[PDB]
Amino acid sequence: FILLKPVFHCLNEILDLCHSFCSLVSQNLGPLDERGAAQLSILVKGFSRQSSLLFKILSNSDLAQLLLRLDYNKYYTQ
Amino acid sequence: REIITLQLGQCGNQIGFEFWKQLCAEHGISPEAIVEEFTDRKDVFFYQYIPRAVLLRVIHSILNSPYAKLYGNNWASGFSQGEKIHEDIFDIIDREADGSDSLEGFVLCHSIAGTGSGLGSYLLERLNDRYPKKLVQTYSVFPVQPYNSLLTLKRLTQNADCLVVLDNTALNRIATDRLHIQSFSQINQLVSTIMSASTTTLRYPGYMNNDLIGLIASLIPTPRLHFLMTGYTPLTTVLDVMRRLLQPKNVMVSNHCYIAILNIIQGEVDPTQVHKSLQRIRERKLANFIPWGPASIQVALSRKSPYLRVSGLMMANHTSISSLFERTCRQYDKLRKREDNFDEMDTSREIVQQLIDEYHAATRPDYIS
Amino acid sequence: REIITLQLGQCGNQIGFEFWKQLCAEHGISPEAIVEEFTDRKDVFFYQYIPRAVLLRVIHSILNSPYAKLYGNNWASGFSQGEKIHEDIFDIIDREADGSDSLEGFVLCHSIAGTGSGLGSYLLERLNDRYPKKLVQTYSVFPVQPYNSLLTLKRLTQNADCLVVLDNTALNRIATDRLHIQSFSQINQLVSTIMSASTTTLRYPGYMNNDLIGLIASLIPTPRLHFLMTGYTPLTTVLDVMRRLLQPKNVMVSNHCYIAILNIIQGEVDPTQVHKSLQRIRERKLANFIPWGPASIQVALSRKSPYLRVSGLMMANHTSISSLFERTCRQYDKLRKREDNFDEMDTSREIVQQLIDEYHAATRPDYIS
Amino acid sequence: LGQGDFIRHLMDLLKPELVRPATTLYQHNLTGILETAVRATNAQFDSPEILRRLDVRLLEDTGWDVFSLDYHVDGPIATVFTRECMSHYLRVFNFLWRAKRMEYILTDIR
Numbered sequence: 001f002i003l004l005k006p007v008f009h010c011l012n013e014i015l016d017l018c019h020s021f022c023s024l025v026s027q028n029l030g031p032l033d034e035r036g037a038a039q040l041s042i043l044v045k046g047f048s049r050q051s052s053l054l055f056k057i058l059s060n061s062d063l064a065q066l067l068l069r070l071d072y073n074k075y076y077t078q
Numbered sequence: 079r080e081i082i083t084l085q086l087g088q089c090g091n092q093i094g095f096e097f098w099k100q101l102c103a104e105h106g107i108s109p110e111a112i113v114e115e116f117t118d119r120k121d122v123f124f125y126q127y128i129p130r131a132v133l134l135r136v137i138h139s140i141l142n143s144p145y146a147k148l149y150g151n152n153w154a155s156g157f158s159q160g161e162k163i164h165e166d167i168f169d170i171i172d173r174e175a176d177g178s179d180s181l182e183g184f185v186l187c188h189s190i191a192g193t194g195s196g197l198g199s200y201l202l203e204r205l206n207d208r209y210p211k212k213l214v215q216t217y218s219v220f221p222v223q224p225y226n227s228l229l230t231l232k233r234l235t236q237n238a239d240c241l242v243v244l245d246n247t248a249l250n251r252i253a254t255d256r257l258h259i260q261s262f263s264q265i266n267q268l269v270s271t272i273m274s275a276s277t278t279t280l281r282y283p284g285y286m287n288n289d290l291i292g293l294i295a296s297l298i299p300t301p302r303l304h305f306l307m308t309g310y311t312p313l314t315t316v317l318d319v320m321r322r323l324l325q326p327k328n329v330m331v332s333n334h335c336y337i338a339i340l341n342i343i344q345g346e347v348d349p350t351q352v353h354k355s356l357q358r359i360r361e362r363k364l365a366n367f368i369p370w371g372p373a374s375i376q377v378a379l380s381r382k383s384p385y386l387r388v389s390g391l392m393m394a395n396h397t398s399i400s401s402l403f404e405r406t407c408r409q410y411d412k413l414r415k416r417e418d419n420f421d422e423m424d425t426s427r428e429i430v431q432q433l434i435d436e437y438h439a440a441t442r443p444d445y446i447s
Numbered sequence: 448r449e450i451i452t453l454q455l456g457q458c459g460n461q462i463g464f465e466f467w468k469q470l471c472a473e474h475g476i477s478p479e480a481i482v483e484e485f486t487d488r489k490d491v492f493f494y495q496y497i498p499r500a501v502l503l504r505v506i507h508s509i510l511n512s513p514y515a516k517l518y519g520n521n522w523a524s525g526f527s528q529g530e531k532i533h534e535d536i537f538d539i540i541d542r543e544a545d546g547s548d549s550l551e552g553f554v555l556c557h558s559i560a561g562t563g564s565g566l567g568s569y570l571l572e573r574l575n576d577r578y579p580k581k582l583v584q585t586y587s588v589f590p591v592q593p594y595n596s597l598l599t600l601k602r603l604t605q606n607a608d609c610l611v612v613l614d615n616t617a618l619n620r621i622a623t624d625r626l627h628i629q630s631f632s633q634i635n636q637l638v639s640t641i642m643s644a645s646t647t648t649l650r651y652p653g654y655m656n657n658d659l660i661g662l663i664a665s666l667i668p669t670p671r672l673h674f675l676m677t678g679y680t681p682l683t684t685v686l687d688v689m690r691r692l693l694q695p696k697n698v699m700v701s702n703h704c705y706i707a708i709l710n711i712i713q714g715e716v717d718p719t720q721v722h723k724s725l726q727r728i729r730e731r732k733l734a735n736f737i738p739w740g741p742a743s744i745q746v747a748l749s750r751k752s753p754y755l756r757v758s759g760l761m762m763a764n765h766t767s768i769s770s771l772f773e774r775t776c777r778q779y780d781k782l783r784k785r786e787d788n789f790d791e792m793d794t795s796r797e798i799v800q801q802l803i804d805e806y807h808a809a810t811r812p813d814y815i816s
Numbered sequence: 817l818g819q820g821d822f823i824r825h826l827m828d829l830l831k832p833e834l835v836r837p838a839t840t841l842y843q844h845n846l847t848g849i850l851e852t853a854v855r856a857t858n859a860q861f862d863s864p865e866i867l868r869r870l871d872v873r874l875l876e877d878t879g880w881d882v883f884s885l886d887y888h889v890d891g892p893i894a895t896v897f898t899r900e901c902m903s904h905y906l907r908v909f910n911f912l913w914r915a916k917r918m919e920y921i922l923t924d925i926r
């Protein structure tokens with residue numbers, strides 16, 4: 001999917017997304033109170049949006065991929 | 079990233095010695111701890127060769143083996159002696175830690191039945207105290223006997239960040255069926271095949287699964303559900319393998335559904351059909367799963383030792399393991415009515431009951447919250 | 448879908464053993480249950496090959512046969528002994544059912560003339576208890592014989608989902624005509640040919656009739672009228688076979704009218720002239736049909752086994768079958784006036800009277816209500 | 817539908833799916849069932865080449881109105897079928913699909 005622009009420009013957003021989240025958990029050792037929770041709910045509104053956004057994209061080669069993510073039909077409930 | 083092993087009690091020391099036997103023979107390392115002439119990255123389990131083992135009557139039998147160059151019964155009786163020689167053994171661990179480049183985990187091999195039960199309980203607490211940054215995987219073995227087992231659980235439920243179960247009663251049944259033994263030295267042979275195959279992807283260089291964290295992190299979703307069970311088919315396409323794994327006659331255990339599944343393929347199978355087997359397997363809907371959490375089935379390839387045909391092992395985190403705990407708790411309650419404070423057993427009785435509920439609650443459509 | 452067969456009594460074992468011999472030779476299956484080298488769908492009746500049989504002295508002579516590698520006289524005595532081994536024989540069936548992919552039905556081969564007849568009546572009821580959604584077709588065979596015959600009739604009229612009658616008096620006359628025998632092993636040759644031919648469209652798949660209910664759903668109009676009779680043309684155009692089956696000197700049965708007809712032509716006949724013949728047979732009016740509802744005649748082709756010419760098989764539903772019950776009925780009354788409650792005989796005598804009353808009223812222009 | 821043995825199993829597996837409306841239907845799910853159906857029937861003993869072309873297509877209600885097989889063919893053999901035989905077979909396949917579910921309904925009632 002390196003040449004397929006739409007998927008490569010959507011998963012890319014998922015890539016740097018985890019950098020922010022993983023840093024958020026590592027940049028402290030206490031509960032998410034000092035505007036961390038305020039920053040936490042920011043990404044889920046975009047991530048889960050980016051999550052189901054990808055879901056419509058796959059609905060030739062994606063059959064081998066979407067099968068693994070959909071083994072428990074969880075995205076079917078999304 | 080190196081991982082050191084710890085062997086306690088009779089069972090632990092016996093299987094670990096054999097665990098190395100299968101391991102050293104898997105590589106070209108003669109019993110006298112030297113490479114034979116006759117690829118396989120050996121950094122995780124060997125130092126330059128010498129294995130990173132820490133062993134604790136039976137040592138005479140091992141020192142009399144050709145491998146001389148390769149290096150009470152109550153829970154209260156075991157825990158008491160361990161505190162006395164605390165600083166004695168922790169010298170060994172410390173000197174082995176800094177001698178290692180970057181220590182990663184602590185494999186523990188012991189039986190929950192007697193000195194290994196208490197000493198292991200003492201270790202796990204102290205190990206977490208000094209080292210809070212180290213994974214702790216344990217190869218515990220299941221069978222006054224019930225009291226020793228329940229006390230270990232209280233420690234294993236919160237200290238060990240990972241765990242595998244190996245029950246003898248189920249293992250012994252495999253012996254009379256397919257091996258016709260009626261012997262510990264024989265039933266242990268399967269354990270070595272189980273243990274060695276459990277960590278195949280760590281020694282052979284691959285794309286992923288290059289660390290113990292790379293394996294367990296997929297299975298355990300929450301630090302409360304940190305128990306696994308095993309499966310091993312060869313006792314020949316990939317579909318032939320995955321089908322024979324999920325049969326209840328092969329697993330090593332004595333509504334309910336899986337949480338995550340790992341598949342270890344040690345053969346030379348053609349990797350183009352592997353995604354096809356999952357398709358057909360998913361359609362057959364041969365195995366049920368949780369409805370709350372999105373997960374899948376993990377499959378990973380490997381290569382068999384050329385110095386030694388397709389095998390296969392499966393790692394399972396099944397909520398049916400809660401049934402086993404009930405038997406221990408059910409028996410103990412019978413003992414509590416059959417006969418310095420006797421409250422430590424009572425607190426553990428509570429904390430083990432919590433784990434049974436957590437599994438039972440996990441099979442619900444609304445386990446979360 | 449699969450179909451499990453049962454063999455009860457001396458007759459069921461013999462005609463079932465001869466059914467499997469013919470069915471093994473019809474396919475490419477050596478007596479050692481191993482496939483020989485030498486299209487035919489054989490998964491329905493064979494398990495990967497193992498027959499799906501449940502056999503119930505005669506067993507020894509079967510086990511001394513070259514096919515060993517292929518696996519009192521009252522009705523009350525035959526009913527009670529089945530109750531004491533109720534749990535026993537079902538474990539064989541319960542494992543074969545769940546071991547089966549998707550069960551469809553239960554073929555029963557038994558003679559109603561006496562331990563086997565009594566055991567059959569018992570098992571026919573319990574299958575209705577456990578499995579509600581499985582067809583039960585019975586290849587019953589007609590002959591204190593009047594007593595046992597009517598009792599099993601009480602169960603065969605409300606338990607068995609279909610029924611194919613084969614009376615010895617019609618088969619023996621055929622053996623003393625074209626066979627010229629003056630033995631049990633001789634007339635069973637004909638019974639095996641009818642049984643093997645009955646399920647021909649199941650093993651060789653075609654455009655239609657790929658399931659057991661597909662053959663039965665056309666003939667049996669209401670759940671009460673579930674009795675069938677057979678016809679073998681040989682003991683060549685398709686117009687000859689049809690006119691050689693409708694004859695009353697070929698039926699295996701010792702006003703009235705037909706309800707539905709099914710024809711099985713197993714030859715290499717020209718499949719383009721089959722629709723022509725049904726255009727002519729209607730004109731000669733060789734058979735009289737029901738006046739209330741619409742009925743027709745059905746012809747289905749197949750392919751003979753190449754490893755072993757035109758043959759035919761006619762399954763019909765004629766209300767003249769009511770006469771056979773009348774003979775057993777009248778024979779019962781004569782013994783009832785000649786010699787803990789003897790009330791079951793009263794209910795059985797009553798319920799078969801309703802079945803006979805259905806037939807004689809099934810031939811009227813107002814069978815509706 | 818000249819096979820009969822394969823279409824029988826294929827109508828038993830699509831029953832839980834096609835009852836839902838078409839909006840929740842996605843092609844990526846039905847293929848899995850189609851591959852399993854070939855194995856579950858006698859169609860497994862077959863030339864691997866012709867089995868590579870047999871797939872599903874989604875006509876554009878209910879799941880029993882948008883399902884149909886395609887069997888696409890390209891190359892030299894495509895000069896015999898010429899995009900019109902494939903626009904005629906599908907015109908036929910509907911009439912053989914309807915007259916096949918109207919029968920398995922009537923053997924379920926029975």
Ligand SMILES: Nc1nc2c(ncn2[C@@H]2O[C@H](COP(=O)(O)OP(=O)(O)O)[C@@H](O)[C@H]2O)c(=O)[nH]1
Pocket residue numbers: 086087088089092093150151189191192193194219221246262263265266
């Ligand atoms: N499966 C298996 N279990 C063993 C073996 N050796 C010991 N055990 C278990 O270890 C328990 C007894 O341990 P024990 O000898 O009292 O340990 P110790 O007190 O430290 O010497 C028993 O319940 C056995 O089930 C072995 O070779 N195989």
Ligand SMILES: Nc1nc2c(ncn2[C@@H]2O[C@H](COP(=O)(O)OP(=O)(O)O)[C@@H](O)[C@H]2O)c(=O)[nH]1
Pocket residue numbers: 456457458461462519520558560561562563564588589590615631632634635638
């Ligand atoms: N059609 C047919 N009927 C048979 C055959 N062998 C036995 N029978 C019938 O079975 C009846 C005898 O049953 P029997 O074997 O004594 O019952 P059991 O002693 O309880 O097994 C007779 O009335 C026969 O009509 C056979 O080969 N063919």
